[PDB]
Amino acid sequence: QYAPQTQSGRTSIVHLFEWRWVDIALECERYLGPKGFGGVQVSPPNENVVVTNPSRPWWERYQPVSYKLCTRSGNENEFRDMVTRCNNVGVRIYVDAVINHMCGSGAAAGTGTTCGSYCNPGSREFPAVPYSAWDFNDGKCKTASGGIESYNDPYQVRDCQLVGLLDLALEKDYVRSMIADYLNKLIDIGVAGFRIDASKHMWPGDIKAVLDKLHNLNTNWFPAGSRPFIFQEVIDLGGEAISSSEYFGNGRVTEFKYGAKLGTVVRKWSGEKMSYLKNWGEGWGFMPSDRALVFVDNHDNQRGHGAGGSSILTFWDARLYKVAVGFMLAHPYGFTRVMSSYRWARNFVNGEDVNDWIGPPNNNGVIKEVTINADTTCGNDWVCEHRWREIRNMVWFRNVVDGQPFANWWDNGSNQVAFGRGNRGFIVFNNDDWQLSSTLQTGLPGGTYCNVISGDKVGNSCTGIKVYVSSDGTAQFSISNSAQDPFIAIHAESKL
Numbered sequence: 001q002y003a004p005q006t007q008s009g010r011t012s013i014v015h016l017f018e019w020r021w022v023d024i025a026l027e028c029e030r031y032l033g034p035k036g037f038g039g040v041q042v043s044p045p046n047e048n049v050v051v052t053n054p055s056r057p058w059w060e061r062y063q064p065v066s067y068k069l070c071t072r073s074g075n076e077n078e079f080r081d082m083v084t085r086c087n088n089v090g091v092r093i094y095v096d097a098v099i100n101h102m103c104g105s106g107a108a109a110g111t112g113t114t115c116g117s118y119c120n121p122g123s124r125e126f127p128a129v130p131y132s133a134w135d136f137n138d139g140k141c142k143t144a145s146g147g148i149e150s151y152n153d154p155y156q157v158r159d160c161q162l163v164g165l166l167d168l169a170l171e172k173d174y175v176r177s178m179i180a181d182y183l184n185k186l187i188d189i190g191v192a193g194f195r196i197d198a199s200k201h202m203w204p205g206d207i208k209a210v211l212d213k214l215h216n217l218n219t220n221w222f223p224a225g226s227r228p229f230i231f232q233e234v235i236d237l238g239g240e241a242i243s244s245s246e247y248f249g250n251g252r253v254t255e256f257k258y259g260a261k262l263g264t265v266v267r268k269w270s271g272e273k274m275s276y277l278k279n280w281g282e283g284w285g286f287m288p289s290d291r292a293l294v295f296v297d298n299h300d301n302q303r304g305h306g307a308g309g310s311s312i313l314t315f316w317d318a319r320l321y322k323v324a325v326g327f328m329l330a331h332p333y334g335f336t337r338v339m340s341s342y343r344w345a346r347n348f349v350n351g352e353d354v355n356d357w358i359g360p361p362n363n364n365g366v367i368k369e370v371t372i373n374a375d376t377t378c379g380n381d382w383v384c385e386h387r388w389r390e391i392r393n394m395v396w397f398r399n400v401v402d403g404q405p406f407a408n409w410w411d412n413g414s415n416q417v418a419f420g421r422g423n424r425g426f427i428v429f430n431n432d433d434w435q436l437s438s439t440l441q442t443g444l445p446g447g448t449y450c451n452v453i454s455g456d457k458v459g460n461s462c463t464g465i466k467v468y469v470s471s472d473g474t475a476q477f478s479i480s481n482s483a484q485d486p487f488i489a490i491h492a493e494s495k496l
């Protein structure tokens with residue numbers, strides 16, 4: 001459960017948020033595979049309720065009505081096709097598994113669902129599964145509201161309703177079996193693992209009971225006896241009742257402290273300096289590296305939901321976002337997940353984005369295709385961060401330095417820092433309000449390297465900055481505080 005199961009050498013996963021199956025299949029073949037991306041985290045592939053108020057929010061996909069592979073992203077055939085095509089080119093598929101609950105208890109009875117299945121949340125009836133009243137935690141929850149009133153009571157968090165979503169009775173084998181049946185179908189199709197949604201809202205033991213029923217991965221692409229990769233979403237910034245460690249036995253866990261702290265440091269808020277990053281990782285009180293799934297931002301906190309708050313860096317702050325993503329992809333700690341979003345019309349009212357519900361780019365509710373521009377960027381409002389040179393080149397950096405130890409750290413005692421990975425790569429940042437012009441030990445063998453942030457190595461030349469490294473591994477780095485991208489990165493494979 002801790003091994004990502006990505007093709008050997010591929011070290012990252014990308015969240016292709018709200019993308020359609022057919023577009024992901026293409027993206028795997030034309031880009032993800034050739035560019036060395038390890039896998040894709042897809043949006044919930046199971047049938048969900050249709051929300052008309054607001055008009056088709058991105059969050060309606062977190063309100064299940066059945067386990068049929070039929071959504072705005074595509075049908076089962078398109079899903080199967082995607083998994084096969086991606087697997088064939090070395091890119092794994094990870095499913096976002098929504099298993100803690102069904103749809104909102106207040107939703108109306110009917111067939112207003114993505115596949116036309118009938119449900120009646122008032123009477124707790126989901127015929128398409130099937131589930132009925134006895135499969136929910138209603139009589140178990142001890143709060144007046146029937147919802148989670150305090151996160152300091154581990155019982156409410158697990159047994160009560162999260163934002164009014166019908167809570168499944170996970171201690172029951174019937175429920176556990178319906179869930180494992182759904183997951184097993186995906187595994188057999190070829191899925192490599194799952195993001196367990198709202199893991200904090202389930203007892204570690206119930207998740208375990210479900211996981212023990214899972215099939216080994218499909219031998220057409222994975223070795224015999226391979227177990228699916230599991231990463232549980234557990235938000236724990238410290239100082240709360242439930243702790244991330246409670247879920248270590250099930251697989252990896254989301255380290256939300258990572259993005260919250262890194263955002264504050266890169267933004268330079270609360271007296272934080274980049275030089276404080278020397279002991280980044282466990283030194284900052286993070287979970288064990290082999291238990292963590294790390295990221296700068298996720299689908300929730302990039303729009304105000306979840307944890308992190310204003311310190312979270314998103315594509316909206318492109319310049320600082322790339323620095324943060326660059327630092328994450330260069331540092332040895334944890335398994336990395338790169339975010340890929342869509343643009344929406346933000347509207348702050350009282351410091352709150354009232355438009356945070358807006359779903360993916362669409363033509364009257366139908367998701368738009370992902371178009372690729374001549375310069376390799378995307379159209380139709382898909383941001384495609386994974387295609388920005390600075391990010392795609394750092395994904396490659398991580399593959400190249402894989403296994404190399406953190407080495408040759410340097411800092412100007414303020415916001416200029418640098419470090420390398422063994423003798424395979426080196427990165428330097430200037431987040432200060434002044435010039436960086438120093439000769440640093442890179443730990444790399446002499447030669448001329450192409451800076452992968454400002455350009456690429458094309459043939460026998462660099463398209464951006466070139467860095468001449470001498471025989472003793474020393475080189476000069478000049479970075480202006482006004483540079484478009486205030487950082488430089490070079491590695492074994494950008495050497496001329």
Ligand SMILES: C[C@H]1O[C@H](O[C@H]2[C@H](O)[C@@H](O)[C@@H](O[C@@H]3C(CO)=C[C@H](N[C@H]4[C@H](O)[C@@H](O)[C@@H](O[C@H]5[C@H](O)[C@@H](O)[C@@H](O[C@H]6[C@H](O)[C@@H](O)[C@H](O)O[C@@H]6CO)O[C@@H]5CO)O[C@@H]4C)[C@H](O)[C@H]3O)O[C@@H]2CO)[C@H](O)[C@@H](O)[C@@H]1N
Pocket residue numbers: 059060061062063098103104105151162163164165197198199200201233235236237238240299300305306307308
């Ligand atoms: C019926 C309802 O429908 C809608 O609800 C939406 C919801 O708005 C969407 O966000 C989305 O939710 C997804 C879900 C639910 O399926 C789960 C995922 N993320 C959620 C977490 O799993 C859940 O734990 C919760 O996080 C808590 C956190 O647990 C808690 O600690 C606290 O965090 C603190 C932190 O501890 C503290 O140290 C720091 O200082 O501050 C933090 C902020 O307080 O609070 C967070 C947030 O409450 O919530 C996560 C969102 C998944 O990633 C989500 O996408 O889908 C649902 C269903 O459609 C409507 O919006 C709602 O109004 C309806 N009633």
Ligand SMILES: OC[C@H]1O[C@@H](O[C@H]2[C@H](O)[C@@H](O)[C@@H](O)O[C@@H]2CO)[C@H](O)[C@@H](O)[C@@H]1O
Pocket residue numbers: 261272276279283284285
């Ligand atoms: O060591 C565990 C704590 O690390 C903290 O990180 C930083 C701190 O924020 C900086 O101001 C500086 O002092 O270095 C620390 C790490 O050496 C973290 O913020 C705390 O929450 C952790 O408990």
Ligand SMILES: OC[C@H]1O[C@H](O[C@H]2[C@H](O)[C@@H](O)[C@@H](O)O[C@@H]2CO)[C@H](O)[C@@H](O)[C@@H]1O
Pocket residue numbers: 318319375376377383384387388389390
């Ligand atoms: O590879 C495509 C494109 O990526 C980068 O462009 C980004 C830019 O860096 C971000 O700051 C933001 O503005 O989005 C841009 C478009 O996606 C490279 O800078 C650019 O040269 C390159 O063509």
Ligand SMILES: OC[C@H]1O[C@@H](O)[C@H](O)[C@@H](O)[C@@H]1O
Pocket residue numbers: 439440468469470471474475476
């Ligand atoms: O003095 C330091 C400098 O020495 C020269 O020999 C090297 O070529 C430079 O890259 C190095 O930074």
Ligand SMILES: [Ca+2]
Pocket residue numbers: 100157158159160167168201202
């Ligand atoms: Ca629960």
Ligand SMILES: [Cl-]
Pocket residue numbers: 195233254298
């Ligand atoms: Cl997540």
